[PDB]
Protein backbone atom coordinates (compact mmCIF):
# COMPACT_ATOMS: atom_id res chain seq x y z
CA UNK A 1 0.00 0.00 0.00
CA UNK A 2 2.88 2.37 0.87
CA UNK A 3 4.30 1.63 -2.60
CA UNK A 4 0.99 2.58 -4.26
CA UNK A 5 1.19 6.03 -2.57
CA UNK A 6 4.96 6.14 -3.29
CA UNK A 7 4.31 5.29 -7.05
CA UNK A 8 2.51 8.69 -7.35
CA UNK A 9 5.48 10.47 -5.68
CA UNK A 10 7.98 8.91 -8.04
CA UNK A 11 5.93 10.13 -11.03
CA UNK A 12 5.97 13.72 -9.78
CA UNK A 13 9.70 13.56 -8.85
CA UNK A 14 10.54 12.14 -12.32
CA UNK A 15 8.96 15.24 -13.85
CA UNK A 16 10.80 17.56 -11.40
CA UNK A 17 14.16 15.92 -12.14
CA UNK A 18 13.59 16.25 -15.90
CA UNK A 19 12.90 19.97 -15.39
CA UNK A 20 16.04 20.28 -13.23
CA UNK A 21 18.30 18.64 -15.83
CA UNK A 22 16.89 21.11 -18.43
CA UNK A 23 18.38 23.83 -16.32
CA UNK A 24 21.83 22.25 -16.85
CA UNK A 25 22.09 22.28 -20.68
CA UNK A 26 25.92 22.02 -20.37
CA UNK A 27 25.44 18.60 -18.73
CA UNK A 28 27.90 19.58 -16.03
CA UNK A 29 25.78 17.85 -13.37
CA UNK A 30 24.41 14.94 -15.48
CA UNK A 31 26.84 12.31 -14.27
CA UNK A 32 29.42 11.91 -11.44
CA UNK A 33 32.26 14.30 -11.44
CA UNK A 34 34.94 12.38 -13.41
CA UNK A 35 37.67 10.99 -11.25
CA UNK A 36 39.77 10.73 -14.40
CA UNK A 37 39.57 14.53 -14.84
CA UNK A 38 39.63 15.33 -11.11
CA UNK A 39 41.69 12.57 -9.44
CA UNK A 40 41.73 14.31 -6.03
CA UNK A 41 37.95 15.03 -5.95
CA UNK A 42 37.07 12.53 -3.18
CA UNK A 43 39.66 14.10 -0.87
CA UNK A 44 37.63 17.31 -1.05
CA UNK A 45 34.11 16.04 -1.43
CA UNK A 46 32.88 13.29 0.85
CA UNK A 47 29.42 12.77 -0.62
CA UNK A 48 29.44 13.17 -4.42
CA UNK A 49 26.10 13.53 -6.19
CA UNK A 50 24.79 14.14 -9.67
CA UNK A 51 21.50 13.83 -11.61
CA UNK A 52 22.16 10.30 -12.92
CA UNK A 53 22.74 9.08 -9.40
CA UNK A 54 19.44 10.81 -8.35
CA UNK A 55 17.66 9.15 -11.28
CA UNK A 56 18.83 5.67 -10.23
CA UNK A 57 17.63 6.27 -6.71
CA UNK A 58 14.31 7.67 -7.98
CA UNK A 59 13.62 4.69 -10.22
CA UNK A 60 14.42 2.29 -7.28
CA UNK A 61 11.65 4.05 -5.27
CA UNK A 62 14.50 5.35 -3.07
CA UNK A 63 12.91 8.73 -2.32
CA UNK A 64 10.23 8.34 0.32
CA UNK A 65 9.50 12.07 0.34
CA UNK A 66 10.37 15.35 -1.39
CA UNK A 67 12.78 16.41 1.32
CA UNK A 68 15.11 13.42 0.60
CA UNK A 69 15.16 14.44 -3.06
CA UNK A 70 15.90 18.11 -2.22
CA UNK A 71 18.72 16.95 0.00
CA UNK A 72 20.42 15.26 -2.97
CA UNK A 73 19.76 18.31 -5.24
CA UNK A 74 21.33 20.53 -2.58
CA UNK A 75 24.38 18.21 -2.40
CA UNK A 76 25.02 18.72 -6.18
CA UNK A 77 24.98 22.50 -5.69
CA UNK A 78 26.90 22.67 -2.37
CA UNK A 79 29.60 20.28 -3.49
CA UNK A 80 30.20 22.41 -6.58
CA UNK A 81 30.36 25.73 -4.71
CA UNK A 82 32.94 24.22 -2.31
CA UNK A 83 35.26 22.57 -4.82
CA UNK A 84 35.26 25.36 -7.45
CA UNK A 85 36.24 29.00 -7.17
CA UNK A 86 33.61 31.64 -7.78
CA UNK A 87 34.71 32.80 -11.26
CA UNK A 88 34.56 29.32 -12.87
CA UNK A 89 32.07 27.91 -15.38
CA UNK A 90 31.29 25.24 -12.71
CA UNK A 91 30.44 27.57 -9.85
CA UNK A 92 28.38 29.78 -12.08
CA UNK A 93 26.54 26.76 -13.45
CA UNK A 94 25.74 25.71 -9.87
CA UNK A 95 24.41 29.19 -9.02
CA UNK A 96 22.11 29.20 -12.07
CA UNK A 97 20.94 25.67 -11.38
CA UNK A 98 20.20 26.59 -7.71
CA UNK A 99 18.36 29.79 -8.71
CA UNK A 100 16.36 28.29 -11.58
CA UNK A 101 15.82 25.01 -9.80
CA UNK A 102 14.45 26.66 -6.68
CA UNK A 103 11.48 27.89 -8.73
CA UNK A 104 10.73 24.39 -9.88
CA UNK A 105 11.04 22.93 -6.34
CA UNK A 106 8.83 25.52 -4.72
CA UNK A 107 6.02 24.48 -7.09
CA UNK A 108 6.85 20.81 -6.43
CA UNK A 109 6.51 21.28 -2.62
CA UNK A 110 2.91 22.53 -3.27
CA UNK A 111 1.94 19.53 -5.38
CA UNK A 112 3.27 17.07 -2.75
CA UNK A 113 1.35 18.69 0.13
CA UNK A 114 -1.91 18.13 -1.91
C1 LIG B 1 35.14 17.53 -15.61
C2 LIG B 1 34.22 18.01 -14.51
C3 LIG B 1 34.69 18.64 -13.35
C4 LIG B 1 33.77 19.11 -12.41
C5 LIG B 1 32.41 18.93 -12.61
C6 LIG B 1 31.93 18.30 -13.77
C7 LIG B 1 32.86 17.88 -14.73
N1 LIG B 1 32.31 17.20 -15.86
C8 LIG B 1 32.44 15.79 -15.97
O1 LIG B 1 33.04 15.13 -15.10
C9 LIG B 1 31.87 15.13 -17.10
C10 LIG B 1 31.97 13.73 -17.25
C11 LIG B 1 31.35 13.10 -18.35
C12 LIG B 1 30.60 13.87 -19.27
C13 LIG B 1 30.48 15.27 -19.14
C14 LIG B 1 29.77 16.05 -20.11
C15 LIG B 1 29.67 17.43 -19.95
C16 LIG B 1 30.29 18.08 -18.85
C17 LIG B 1 30.99 17.31 -17.90
C18 LIG B 1 31.11 15.91 -18.04
C19 LIG B 1 31.59 17.96 -16.80
O2 LIG B 1 31.52 19.19 -16.65
N2 LIG B 1 31.79 19.48 -11.54
C20 LIG B 1 30.34 19.52 -11.30
C21 LIG B 1 32.75 19.95 -10.68
O3 LIG B 1 32.54 20.49 -9.59
N3 LIG B 1 33.93 19.70 -11.24
C22 LIG B 1 35.26 20.03 -10.66
Characterization of the model:
This protein has one domain (about 1-114): Bromodomain-like (Histone Acetyltransferase, Chain A). Helix content is about 70%, strand content about 0%. It is built from five helices and no strands. The longest helix has 25 residues, at about 90-114. The protein is globular. Ligand 8LW binds next to helix 4. The ligand Cc1cc2c(cc1N1C(=O)c3cccc4cccc(c34)C1=O)n(C)c(=O)n2C binds near residues 34 and 80.
Helix content estimate: 55-70%
Distance between the termini: 18 Å
* Backbone structural class: mainly alpha
Question: What is the CATH topology classification name?
Answer: Histone Acetyltransferase, Chain A
Q: What is the element string, with H for helices and E for strands?
A: HHHHH
PDB class: transcription
Keywords: bromodomain, chemical probe, transcription
Assembly: monomeric
Entry title: BRPF2 in complex with Compound 7
Offer a few descriptive terms.
114 residues, mainly alpha, Histone Acetyltransferase, Chain A, 5 helices, binds the ligand Cc1cc2c(cc1N1C(=O)c3cccc4cccc(c34)C1=O)n(C)c(=O)n2C, Bromodomain-containing protein 1
Brief account:
It is globular and about 45 Å long. The chain is mostly helical.
Topology record:
Blueprint: H1 2-22, H2 41-44, H3 51-59, H4 66-83, H5 89-113
Helix pairs in contact: 1-3, 1-5, 4-5
The structure holds ligand 8LW.
Amino acid sequence: AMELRLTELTRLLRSVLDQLQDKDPARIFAQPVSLKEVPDYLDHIKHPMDFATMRKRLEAQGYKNLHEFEEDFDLIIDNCMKYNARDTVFYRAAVRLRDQGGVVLRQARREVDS
